[PDB]
């Protein structure tokens, strides 16, 4: 504004930002899906107490005693 005052060639009456007056899932809805929550804390506390024993569950290209099984020990 003071610059506009001090500058003679600068005219006025200008709506500066000239603009355009602009004015302003289904898979679950199938005949066969059953999307169910496991109730994370419920199933978690359930399987949580179920201890799991392991004893060197080792398998990668390991030769000796052909059959192997993960979580070897018991708990």
């Amino acid at each position: 504004d003071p610059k506009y005052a001090d500058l003679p060639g600068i005219a006025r009456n200008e709506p500066d930002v000239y603009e355009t007056s602009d004015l302003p899932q289904e898979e679950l809805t199938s005949t066969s899906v059953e999307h169910i929550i496991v109730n994370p804390n419920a199933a978690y506390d359930k399987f949580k107490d179920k201890r799991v024993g392991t004893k060197g569950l080792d398998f990668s290209d390991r030769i000796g005693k052909t059959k192997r099984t993960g979580y070897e020990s018991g708990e």
């Binding site: 899932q25 289904e26 898979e27 679950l28 199938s30 005949t31 066969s32 899906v33 059953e34 999307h35 169910i36 929550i37 496991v38 994370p40 804390n41 199933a43 978690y44 359930k46 399987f47 949580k48 201890r51 799991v52 024993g53 392991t54 569950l57 080792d58 398998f59 990668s60 290209d61 390991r62 993960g70 708990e75």
Partner: protein, 370 residues
């Protein structure tokens, strides 16, 4: 460490994150590595040149977005490290590796080099005290509560069926295919070029994904619905501009069962699952039939599962009842299963200490893992 374990839903195309004590991942985002395709001289643009989150989620037409997990297998690990640092950053966790137990995800029969490289990061650069990374199938098992079943975990760019009864592995029956929805989106831009739409950018590929996740489904009849007259649904661009569709929206994921269109041999992963069924035990099969595990966001199509039910009817014998196990938020389902697994206290033997990595590393990875 006695801290909250970092639960990362590291999917090939959708890599989310969070913690165990939280039943919702708070740091969800897909796979993306953007590098500015434009020079910047005048001040006003922020830098880092590897943008994750907002910058990448706003300036799509400026950053050369990379999807470093090539079929879930990344070789530009450096970028992933920076994304993990972004996770350690203020926007996601403000924590350290040493400060928390960590949990990432895995795919079956990956190249050992990737696992080794990842362990190098998390135990050399990052220095997690106790950590273990495993299959997404177990996460889904927690998401279902089931223990018996053929985990059909088919994400963004990987499709795999994991047959496991009562928590007992059967790798010979377990199959894995490193191709999925990402390629159907690739095929979608192939449709674009079929009708002349040179939207080659990764951002343009995201627009393609927006249509994929916006106007696409599965018509259960192949030629009976393909050879008909299409209405050519006018999709609205990131400008809202009209673009028709054609039969494209439903005939695009057909390639997943006839890979010959892309010049590939396969059967349609469900048939590979039927092969796994054949690899299993006769009456124990029926259970797995009823164990219709649904995983990977690529499964989101109207009539998708029903088309696969039709596939079952075309290939499975009578009365071998199948039972759809749908997840609500399939992507979070995996993460929440990981939250359950990470929240397991007994994880002692299940994790891998940092000193263990210092003892053997690779040998101890592949040793302790399957």
């Amino acid at each position: 460490i006695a801290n909250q374990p970092v639960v990362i839903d590291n999917g090939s195309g959708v890599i989310k994150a969070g913690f165990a004590g939280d039943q919702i991942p708070k740091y969800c985002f897909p796979n993306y590595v953007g590098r500015p395709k434009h020079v910047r001289v005048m001040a006003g643009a922020l830098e880092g040149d590897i943008f994750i989150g907002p910058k990448a989620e706003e300036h799509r037409g400026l950053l050369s977005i990379r999807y470093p997990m090539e079929h879930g297998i990344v070789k530009d690990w450096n970028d992933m490290e920076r994304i993990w640092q972004y996770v350690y950053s203020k926007d996601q966790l403000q924590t350290f590796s040493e400060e928390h137990p960590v949990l990432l995800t895995e795919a079956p029969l990956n190249p050992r080099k990737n696992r080794e490289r990842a362990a190098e990061v998390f135990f050399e650069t990052f220095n997690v005290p106790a950590l273990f990374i495993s299959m997404q199938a177990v996460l889904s098992l927690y998401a279902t509560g089931r223990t018996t079943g053929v985990v059909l975990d088919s994400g963004d760019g990987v499709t795999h069926a994991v047959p496991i009864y009562e928590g007992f592995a059967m790798p010979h029956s377990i199959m894995r295919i490193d191709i999925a929805g990402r390629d159907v989106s690739r095929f979608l831009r192939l449709y674009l070029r079929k009708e002349g739409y040179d939207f080659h950018s990764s951002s343009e590929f995201e627009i393609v994904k927006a249509i994929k996740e916006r106007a696409c489904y599965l018509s259960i009849n192949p030629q009976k619905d393909e050879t008909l007259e299409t209405e050519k649904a006018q999709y609205y661009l990131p400008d809202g501009s009209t673009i028709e569709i054609g039969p494209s929206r439903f005939r695009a994921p057909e390639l997943l069962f006839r890979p010959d269109l892309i010049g590939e041999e396969s059967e349609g992963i469900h048939e590979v699952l039927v092969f796994a069924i054949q690899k299993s035990d006769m009456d124990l099969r029926r259970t797995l039939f009823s164990n219709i595990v649904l995983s990977g966001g690529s499964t989101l199509f109207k009539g998708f599962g029903d088309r696969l039910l039709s596939e079952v009817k075309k290939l499975a014998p009578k009365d071998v009842k199948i039972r759809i196990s749908a997840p609500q938020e399939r992507l979070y389902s995996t993460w929440i299963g990981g939250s359950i697994l990470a929240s397991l206290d007994t994880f002692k033997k299940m994790w891998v200490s940092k000193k263990e990595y210092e003892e053997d590393g690779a040998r101890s990875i592949h040793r302790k893992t399957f």
